[PDB]
Design a binder for this molecule. Structure first.
Ligand SMILES: CC(=O)N[C@@H]1[C@@H](O)[C@H](O)[C@@H](CO)O[C@H]1O
Ligand SMILES: *[C@@H]1O[C@H](CO)[C@@H](O)[C@H](O)[C@H]1NC(C)=O
Ligand SMILES: *[C@@H]1O[C@H](CO)[C@@H](O)[C@H](O)[C@H]1NC(C)=O
Ligand SMILES: *[C@@H]1O[C@H](CO)[C@@H](O)[C@H](O)[C@H]1NC(C)=O
Lengths: 79, 129, 25
């Protein structure tokens, strides 16, 4: 399986295109996310001489769900 | 006084040998069987209707979002699999829902209900719908 | 005649699905 989720790290917005979707923190529900690490719970991992913004978007058919979620774990590796 | 009403969780459509109940783990596809019982009460003529059994992702009964389970005294719509088996006449009222868990990030689903104690003497309040 | 009743347990599902991962610069 593969979706080819188009992730397009910008200078101020992380944007991931691929039902309601939401980031780790319940808002940012439309998919965009500000690059500010204090916004919708973006994970910061500064491995040496780089900085990656990891996040786990989730797609669910209805706000109640039955046996099917879409846990898209996308990261942005900035210089 | 207080007509203390209790409700438990049974494991099967089989309405006995239920779960003891501390924190139940279920397949989202699976089914659970909760029945409101009028234990420790009149039970000779007082029925037990199921008016507003509902669900919410918080111990508190006052949440912004909450699952309906059954509104307006019976059989909430919008749910594919709902069965109020014997709510109403008997001192035991039973209904079945498929497991679920809400939007956002919290795996904590709770069940809350509102119960009105009908009587079966010259009071035709069988819950009709 | 209109008391409120709650279930004394937590309903913990085992919802799980297809993990995905991607990269970007
Ligand atoms: C949730 C699930 O069913 N499987 C895995 C989970 O065990 C793991 O912790 C997670 C980390 O990204 O990835 C997914
Ligand atoms: C999420 O947005 C709702 C408005 O829909 C607001 O009530 C709530 O405080 C927000 N929560 C966070 C963590 O931003
Ligand atoms: C950190 O991870 C990125 C991911 O592509 C990689 O390019 C980089 O080499 C890693 N840093 C180190 C020090 O290995
Ligand atoms: C079903 O019937 C009774 C009560 O419903 C129970 O004692 C019996 O063990 C059950 N049989 C099963 C679950 O196979």
């Amino acid at each position: 399986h593969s979706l080819q989720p188009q992730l397009d790290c910008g200078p101020r917005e992380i944007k991931v295109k691929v039902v309601i979707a939401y980031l780790r923190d319940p808002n940012c529900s439309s998919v965009t996310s500000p690059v500010q690490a204090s916004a919708c719970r973006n994970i910061l991992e500064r491995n040496q001489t780089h900085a990656i913004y990891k996040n786990t978007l989730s797609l669910v058919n209805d706000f109640i769900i039955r046996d099917t979620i879409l846990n898209i774990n996308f990261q942005c590796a900035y210089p």
